[PDB]
Amino acid sequence: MRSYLILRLAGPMQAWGQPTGTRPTGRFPTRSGLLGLLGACLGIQRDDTSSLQALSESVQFAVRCDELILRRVSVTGLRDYHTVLIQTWREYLCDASFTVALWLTPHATMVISELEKAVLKPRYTPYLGRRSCPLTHPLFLGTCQPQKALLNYEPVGGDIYSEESVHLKFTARDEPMITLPRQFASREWYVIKGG
């Protein structure tokens, strides 16, 4: 088994990017977004591409949508009417929590050590999608040695979207070009449902 770094993405509101009148969310974090989160934790500035590209060539993700109890509470979504003195509608996610397995690709330069130090003492304010969205639980360190490391870190049974194969796929415009600053490519999530 290779090394995994586990994370907790959970806040009363979150918002994960999707193409546009309104600015809507998906139901889980995006890759562009998770990159955002991570680069943020590290000393990363938008202009300095080479380092961002190194990050993106270095890391891979698996995300678990897993839900509230009380009796359970399935995730709901709100529509924020957000104005500028120009009108926008901005979708946010209510009662979202995610567990995230993060592993290193056969490419360098990061080692999971660098990344947990980064997650622990972030250089940049971290936020679930928009800075409007603080998070309730710090990105806790995982250490554990597929989906199996997630089976370790409770709460179980929420199903996982992931870049390892196990098969259904779910196609998304998550993957950011870094050469065209704010655009994206066509990536595919592998889907592992339930248990």
Partner 1 sequence: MSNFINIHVLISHSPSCLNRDDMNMQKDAIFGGKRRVRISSQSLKRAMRKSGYYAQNIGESSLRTIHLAQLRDVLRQKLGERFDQKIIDKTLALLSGKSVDEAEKISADAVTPWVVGEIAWFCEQVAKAEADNLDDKKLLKVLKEDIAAIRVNLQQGVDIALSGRMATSGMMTELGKVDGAMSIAHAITTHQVDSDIDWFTAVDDLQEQGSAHLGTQEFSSGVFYRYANINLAQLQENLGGASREQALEIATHVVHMLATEVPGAKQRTYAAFNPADMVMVNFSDMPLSMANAFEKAVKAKDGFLQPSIQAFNQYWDRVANGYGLNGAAAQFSLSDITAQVKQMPTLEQLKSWVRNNGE
Partner 2 sequence: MNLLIDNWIPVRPRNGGKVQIINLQSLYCSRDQWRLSLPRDDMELAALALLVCIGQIIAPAKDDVEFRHRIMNPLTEDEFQQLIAPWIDMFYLNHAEHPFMQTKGVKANDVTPMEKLLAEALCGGCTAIALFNQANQAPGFGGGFKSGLRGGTPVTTFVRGIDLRSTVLLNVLTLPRLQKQFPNESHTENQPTWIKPIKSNESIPASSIGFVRGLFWQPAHIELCDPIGIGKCSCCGQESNLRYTGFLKEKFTFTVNGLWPHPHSPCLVTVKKGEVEEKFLAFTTSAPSWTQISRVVVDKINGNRVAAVVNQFRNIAPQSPLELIMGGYRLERRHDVLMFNQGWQQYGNVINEIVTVGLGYKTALRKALYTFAEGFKNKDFKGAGVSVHETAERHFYRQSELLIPDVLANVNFSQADEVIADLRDKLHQLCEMLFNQSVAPYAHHPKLISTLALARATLYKHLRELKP
Write out the residues near partner 2 by the rule CB under 8 A: 56-57, 60, 105, 163, 168-169, 171, 173, 175, 177, 179-180, 183-186, 188
- Under 8 Å CB-to-CB from 55, ≥6 apart: which residues? 35, 38, 39, 42, 44, 110
Q: Is 105 helix (H, G, I), strand (E, B) or coil?
A: coil
Q: What are residue 187's phi and psi, to 5 degrees?
A: -110, 160
131 near partner 1, judged by CB under 8 A: yes
Does the footprint of partner 1 cover residue 122 (CB under 8 A)?
yes
Sign, CA dihedral 74-157-162-37, equals positive
Residue bearing tokens 């889907």: 191
Min dist CB 92 to partner 2, Å, is 15
Q: If you search the block for the tokens 């509230």, which residue do you land on?
A: 68
Neighbours of 17 (CB within 10 A): 19
Residue 172 tokens, joined: 């998304």
Residue 137 interacts with partner 1 (CB under 8 A): yes or no: yes
Least separation in angstroms between CB 164 and partner 1 = 28
Distance between CA atoms of residues 156 and 158, nearest Å:
6
88 contacts 82 by C-beta, under 8 angstroms: yes
133 binding partner 1? (CB under 8 A): yes
Q: From residue 140 to residue 159, what is the string marking binding to partner 1 with x (rule CB under 8 A)?
A: x-------------------
**20 binding partner 1? (CB under 8 A):** no
The reply to whether 171 sits near partner 1 by the rule CB under 8 A is no
DSSP, res 184 = B
Residue from 27, 111, 114, 138 touching partner 1 (CB under 8 A): that is 138
Burial class (CB in 10 A: 0-12, 13-18, 19+), 99: buried
**Counting contacts by CB under 8 A, is residue 95 touching partner 1?**
yes
Q: Does 23 contact partner 1 by CB under 8 A?
A: no
The window from 21-29, 115-123, 151-159, 178-186 that contacts partner 1 (CB under 8 A) reads 115-123
Which of the listed partners (partner 2, partner 1, none) does 177 bind, with a CB threshold of 5 to 8 Å by partner kind? Answer: partner 2
Q: Which residues bind partner 1 (CB under 8 A)?
A: 11-13, 68, 70, 73, 76, 78, 80-83, 87, 92, 94-95, 119-127, 131-140
